[PDB]
Design a protein around this ligand. Sequence first.
Ligand SMILES: COCCNC(=O)c1nc(-c2ccc(S(=O)(=O)N3CCN(C)CC3)cc2)cnc1N
Length: 347
Amino acid sequence: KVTTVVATPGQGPDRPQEVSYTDTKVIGNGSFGVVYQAKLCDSGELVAIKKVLQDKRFKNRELQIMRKLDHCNIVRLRYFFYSSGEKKDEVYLNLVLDYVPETVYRVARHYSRAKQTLPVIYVKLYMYQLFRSLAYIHSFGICHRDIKPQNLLLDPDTAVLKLCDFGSAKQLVRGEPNVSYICSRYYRAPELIFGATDYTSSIDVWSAGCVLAELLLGQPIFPGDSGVDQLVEIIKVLGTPTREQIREMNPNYTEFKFPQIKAHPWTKVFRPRTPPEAIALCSRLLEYTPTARLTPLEACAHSFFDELRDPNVKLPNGRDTPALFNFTTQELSSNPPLATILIPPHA
Ligand SMILES: COCCNC(=O)c1nc(-c2ccc(S(=O)(=O)N3CCN(C)CC3)cc2)cnc1N
């Protein structure tokens, strides 16, 4: 069964094209509608169609953001078009994206069921690629707002990570308020747990540190039954924030959940047989103070990733490491002189 739809390229000139696809399989659900997997008849390559119900008296925020993005470690928007259900009003915006077979969550989840830890090289590979994607969208002022392992796609063979689900991403315009019940809990920055609406892109940096620590520990570092319990578990490990730290997180609130609980060391948080520059990265990612957290660009050049910058380092299945040095000037803009470290010898 071959379906032919008139789709506009998600990057290219505004030139609607006949796109034919088949093998339509549902893969995902959500707030927005439904996610499918499909095969382009002509090129035979697999794609994902994210189908959202669209009201025409406001443009889809995700769509405006997708048509401005293009990176190695981000699922690219190939096309978009409009469908409908039965009656009219009932307009569906459909996003044709690249399909990536696996996700970090489902990888991380197995090793955990096998009582095993993910090999450290995969931690470095997947965190570095995530940082690159973060430094790129933050250079536009776009904040994902929903970093979680299930929103990171992986190819098992090439070890390529591609960030997906831009449903909660938003251009942060300074002076416009921004909501605080964003982020998929567990990875919900301190500022948002206290209900701050004056946040920056560093909330993705926090969420990334929660993803890093989860891959190191083999389970979510900051669990919790609600937004309140997330604060308990953060305070359990990072201690009660100082009142200066509280002022920097949210310039609004403090309704003491309970008392000051103090911190316990990073060394005692993780497994003993795995404490290298990985613990130093977590201590630079998971800080209360938003301006004290690393930039995704500064995180890529951290000591923990230095194995990947070696010209001789090779993937576990013997293959080459995927592109880890093909930066743009937009991606380097926050700190251009960091290219000293980012681009090693080796071409
Ligand atoms: C709304 O936000 C974005 C929604 N998602 C995307 O856009 C997107 N999703 C994926 C994806 C990858 C893995 C899986 S899976 O859990 O490993 N698995 C589930 C069932 N199935 C039989 C096998 C696959 C599910 C989906 C890939 N590329 C995408 N472009």
